[PDB]
Design a protein around this ligand. Sequence first.
Ligand SMILES: [Cl-]
Ligand SMILES: [Cl-]
Ligand SMILES: [Cl-]
Length: 163
Amino acid sequence: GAMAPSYRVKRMDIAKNDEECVVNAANPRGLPGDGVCKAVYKKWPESFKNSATPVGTAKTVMCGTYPVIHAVGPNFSNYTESEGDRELAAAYREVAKEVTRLGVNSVAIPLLSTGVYSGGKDRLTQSLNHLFTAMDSTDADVVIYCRDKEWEKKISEAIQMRT
Ligand SMILES: [Cl-]
Ligand SMILES: [Cl-]
Ligand SMILES: [Cl-]
């Protein structure tokens, strides 16, 4: 575990992370996809061997010795708000299990279901709160990656609020 487990936020490409493993915002079929998933495919393509997994689950595939945790959030275009909320919570619980099993001291993680799976809604608070519910009992350093300047400020605020 980390000596003083922390949360941090960085605004940059998660393919350039400085952590011991990465969480991919994957699709259920293990396809290259777009956004975070396409960046992850360009950096760690070997990790997409047999990466297909259902909504609400995470499946880890090694790229060399570097673990890529494929976490499948719901597409809110297809799920009801209620069922989507349950699947998004479940995907993060499976990420916490994998991070624990791998014995890493740090993990790079995007906000699941906030991009093309958001069904056109701002889900920063919803996705971040499910991330915290899952990861708070882990002792890995968690570094959250985003691309938007206003999202960076809001995520940083939410982390600092609890400190
Ligand atoms: Cl960048
Ligand atoms: Cl997304
Ligand atoms: Cl973002």
